[PDB]
């Protein structure tokens, strides 16, 4: 996260780390949506241009974390995966359309003060909250400064970082980029004029864009960190997978097994 700040403890108890187990590295963020299901970006697992193709046994999920690099001994829980599900029409050839994946955990996690699921939106929560100008929140342990162009100024955080960003109008989104934008995406970030900065960055992909509902006080996951050109570059925006537009596939797959 670029231009964010340190999360409070227990501020985002649905944040998950995707961690590979040799070499030990952070791949991506993710989120906990029930005791057995994790939501992430499909490009975290599967990206042929770069010969990336992870399966279950390649990965650990880590839940309950605050520190990026510490094993948080009586706080985090590490889990193994039993099944990965990628959207069957994820478009890695062109524009990362339908950038979504579900992971089934081998056995359920227990909730705690540090581990707690986020809600998925319904139609009326989506309708009402997904409006240009409304702010959402992004979290993660990714770079603090541009890294598809690897940077200094500090590099990597020690602790989970947070930033709140406005949703942007679809025309300004589409006019910022040469990539074809779909309805399954939205963009977010401040405009060059507005004074404020901030963005996701590498290592943050896969994690939650969340908003809090003013009607019932719950946190809802509205996007997944998907792509963007650079990090925090002026006149560029972050793009997120639209979680509500893909909720039927989510339900479909967690109903089919579904056990």
């Amino acid at each position: 996260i670029v231009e964010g700040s340190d999360a409070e403890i227990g501020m985002s108890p649905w944040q998950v780390m995707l961690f590979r187990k040799s070499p030990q590295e952070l791949l991506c963020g993710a989120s906990l949506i029930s005791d057995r299901w994790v939501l992430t970006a499909a490009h975290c697992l599967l990206y042929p241009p770069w010969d990336k193709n992870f399966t279950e046994n390649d990965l650990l999920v880590r839940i309950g974390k605050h520190s990026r690099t510490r094993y948080e001994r009586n706080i985090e829980k590490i889990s193994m995966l039993e099944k990965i599900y990628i959207h069957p029409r994820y478009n890695w050839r062109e524009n990362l359309d339908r950038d979504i994946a579900l992971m089934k955990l081998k056995k359920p996690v227990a909730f705690s003060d540090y581990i707690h699921p986020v809600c998925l939106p319904d139609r009326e929560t989506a309708a009402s909250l997904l409006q240009a100008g409304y702010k959402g929140r992004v979290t993660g342990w990714g770079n603090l400064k541009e890294t598809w162009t690897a940077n200094v100024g500090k590099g990597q955080p020690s602790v989970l970082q947070v930033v709140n960003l406005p949703i942007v109008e679809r025309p300004v989104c589409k006019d910022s980029t040469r990539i074809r934008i779909t309805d399954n995406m939205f963009c977010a970030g401040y405009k060059p004029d507005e004074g404020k900065r901030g963005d996701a960055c590498e290592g943050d992909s896969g994690g939650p864009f969340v908003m809090k509902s003013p009607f019932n006080n719950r946190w809802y996951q509205m996007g997944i960190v998907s792509w963007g050109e650079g990090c925090d570059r002026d006149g560029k925006y972050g793009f997120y997978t639209h979680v509500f537009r893909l909720k039927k596939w989510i339900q479909k797959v967690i109903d089919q097994f579904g056990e």
Binding site: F19, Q24, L60, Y71, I78
Partner: peptide, 10 residues
């Protein structure tokens, strides 16, 4: 860069 995790997780 990461601290070592317990070997029952591998």
């Amino acid at each position: 860069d990461f601290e070592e995790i317990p070997e029952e997780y591998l």
